[model samples]
Target chain A: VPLPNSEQFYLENDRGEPYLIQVSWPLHWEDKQTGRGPLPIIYIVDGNALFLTATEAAWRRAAASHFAGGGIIVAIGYPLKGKLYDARRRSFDLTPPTACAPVGYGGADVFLDFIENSVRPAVQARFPQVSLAREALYGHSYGGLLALHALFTRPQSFDCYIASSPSIWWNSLCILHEAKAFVETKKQSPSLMVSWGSWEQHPPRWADELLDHYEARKRTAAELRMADNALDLCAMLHGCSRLHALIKTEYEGEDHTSVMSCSVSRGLTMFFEDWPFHQ
Target chain B: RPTPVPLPNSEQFYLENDRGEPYLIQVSWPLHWEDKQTGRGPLPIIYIVDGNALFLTATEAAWRRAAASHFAGGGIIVAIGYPLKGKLYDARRRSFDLTPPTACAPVGYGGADVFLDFIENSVRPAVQARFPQVSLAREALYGHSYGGLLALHALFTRPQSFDCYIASSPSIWWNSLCILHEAKAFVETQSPSLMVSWGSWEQHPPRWADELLDHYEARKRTAAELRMADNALDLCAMLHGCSRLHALIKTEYEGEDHTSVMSCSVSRGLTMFFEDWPFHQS
Candidate 1:
């Protein structure tokens, strides 16, 4: 629907596939630069699916005024008219290179560069009232994986991070290994919210009748290569468990599929209350 | 930019008591119900306190989350509260309205019977009159902190006003837990359909205050209760009878605090309250 919002670079040296970036704001919004009060921004990965849901929740809260944690919820998603499900491209951009990477993997560095250098500036210019010093990233699964990489490597990018069910098993536990070496040198630690499903490693209790049947066929079901192995599953759960101990919210009774909405609800709660708002 | 409209699917009003004190009430209902394999009738109802504030966020979150998911239950979300003209009246008024009469209680406290009288006479009639689609027999009351104190008090005092009760982080620690002692006496006899929860970090205050290490350790130091002598806010001896209250209800939503737990507690509590509806094991 628009051109300038594309992720493609114009300079001769710049390179990548283009992403159609979409932006939205609060219902009754005005920029402080344009005589309105200041507003904070929340960046959501996989915006195509999540942006509207979050905006709905935030707008309802905003309708209440004083109790509202006012601001913008900006979703970072693919082209609006793109495929409904594009796993290949996400794997390409959201992961770092490793011996176990699938084809077209490891574009996270370039992706974050676009977020830090290109996207942030464009958003701030559009909504001049944004508290530039305070920003947040909302991601789940692969997006969560990449957000953690950014949190570890470039802590200054966002003051807050909300990662739900981060794929910590990526590249043979690359970020986990990076974590062992990484140290927090910043004067102020980023407020991070991490959560995972209670049923991540298995089927839900409601599926008990089919569990035995699916339990046998599921192992060979082609989706197993990157995400599951008895050992890999064990390691990932432990990694997420360690993360839960680090973050304050655990988000009970959620699974990988349900954790996204569960975490987003709390993420926005934290966004308004923690980053730049709460004293 | 499109102009905004009044929040869709909800209505707000105010009714004055005989004393001319005004109370605000708001109700939000489910317009679009998802296809469920079981249960169909007039939707259930939930009553929340402090509509002037809590209704702003809590009501909509619960409503929207229910609308989107099939595993969740749906119903009317009603917020009942009072507006402030700046007086000790708002807080202390609720203090008197939510507590029960006792020899150990303060003069202003324990006007809960009168408060319940207002709900039964004024509020319920107003609600039933406006929303003809509500289930009078299927109703719930939700409260947190002091509102929670009122919710538990109502459940203990009148067992049949509503089908069930949902209390999140109930302030069981109030008045040296005059209410908890009352509940302990009724719990074996009452057996109400109730759900209770609190944050795991509730113990952190005492643990960090004097390196007391844990709730068990903090309980040994009776001097640390009211003074806190070393901390920012005094927690009224900080949850004196909470676990005892929780043992009666037997529901725990881990990792939620006194403030943050409200959303999850409401969502989970509603699901449990309506679980037997239409008599299907969902």
Candidate 2:
């Protein structure tokens, strides 16, 4: 069943790869007489997994204030049915190119191009009143890697970037090079917020039912160093004085999977908190 | 068009109270809960009011943790809503059932006493009967708006019924703060944990206030008459100072309104009550 007050459709890229585009606008998104100029937009990745969480978070925020109430939510994801995520498809769409990376990776640029050209334009064409100037890009895990790529490579595309439990370990941390380049360019940059769970470093053994594979899972988690990588990236980005905003958080007691919803809830607060969007 | 995913292992049934008023009860069980149970004891349960509107949000949030690991306190979700077709709320019924008595109560109001009695005698027994094998452990009650008022009523009158009470954006201003009368006596007894929260933006007019003239006009009297944040804070302060309570907390959900704070309250309430379930682990 469709969500109340929301819409979803499929849009194919130039390469004929299908992407599911989901959108949910705040109540009274088009009301011009309220003296509110235009509503902001939150563009999320991994829509199948994160759409409802993001939409409800935005709705909660939007229901509070007059001016900075909720904004628009646009999710970019693959066309998967009865699944939270398409692992194989996202492996390609969300990763950046690296010499050491395997095939079916490094389609981040093309996926981004599809979003910037096709998905966004389609949204604006339908709801012309939404604010194009103030927009945020949110992603988690591999999708978080893509959000950072968009920020470092094309800072002008979005006003804010929220990377939750980002796969900074992907391809031997190659994205760090892009971050270095971004700093060297000296662009008065867009906002960036990185978040992850403390448990990402060590999955508590008691919570695991598969004790036989517990050690292996712990080893993999330690190798990935999810929380450390997020903290390190935020520390590196802090050097750039041109950023509009920069913040990082480590949520205690939350695991990698559970932290996604918490991060999305808090990330939207960066834009929606207070009456920030008022004219 | 892609459809919204439904909560896994969920079902709905209509239950009639003593008054013959039917309520839509939506139950979402934890996935493979029976197989995963190490002990044959009753599991934890959460009772959500306004099931028609909040059942999905609460279930999805709970499922996120349930899918990840065992720490999420996997339990049964029983949401109580009216059996009204194609509507989020049966406003008339809710107004009557959720409100407590006042000196000059509006017509068809002040049925919270009967409502509470119905839940204790009828609803609990029916749910227990359905899950005869799966006994329920610690239980929590969650409500919002007028429903929130009912939760407070439940807590004050029958503190032994629920282990925890979450009242989000409660109608404390109702009936000239008559609910305070209950609080006066409630402070003397041992009470369960209580969470009182409201949206930061609730004191002001909503975004669509300009277009909703009738609503705006209707609420103008209350706008000056009652202060949502201030009243909640006062009540929280009163409760916090008392030593009889097990636990108490007050939160201001940032960037949320009375209407939108429901989802946040339910999501956050679950975490507060059951995040560290099984109590045996760190």
Q: How much of the real interface does each model capture, measured as fnat?
A: 0.04, 0.17
The backbone clash count of each candidate, in order, is 1, 4
In candidate 2 the C-alpha lDDT for residue A106 amounts to 93
Off by over 4 Å in 1: A1-41, A44-130, A140-156, A166-192, A199-249, A253-279, B2-6, B17-19, B31-40, B63-69, B84-93, B134-137, B184-191, B206-255, B274-282
* Candidate 1, A1-279: lDDT as tens digits: 111111221211137565544455544443224324556678877665555445544553543212344566666666433122247767876786577666799878877887777777766666664455468888878888887777767766777877777787556568765554444231355556666655454433332235666665445322423234323433433333123223534456543544455477567755764443221
Best candidate, lDDT-wise?
A: 2
Q: Over all chains combined, what TM-score does candidate 2 have?
A: 0.72
Compose the digit string of candidate 2's lDDT tens values, residues A52-136.
7777666555334333555778878776543467778899989998888898999999988888889888887757544564788
Which tens-of-lDDT digit does each residue in B1-282 have in candidate 1?
Answer: 212212335677887765566787877654343322222456667777654445534444444343232334556667777854321126766787667777888778877777777777888889887765445657778776667777777877786776667666666666776775656555445223555555543433222222325654654354334221222112213322433222234334454434444555655555444433322121
Listed in order, each prediction's TM-score against the native is 0.61, 0.72
Q: Can you list each candidate's DockQ? A: 0.12, 0.19
User: What is the Cα-based lDDT of residue B183 in candidate 1?
Assistant: 62
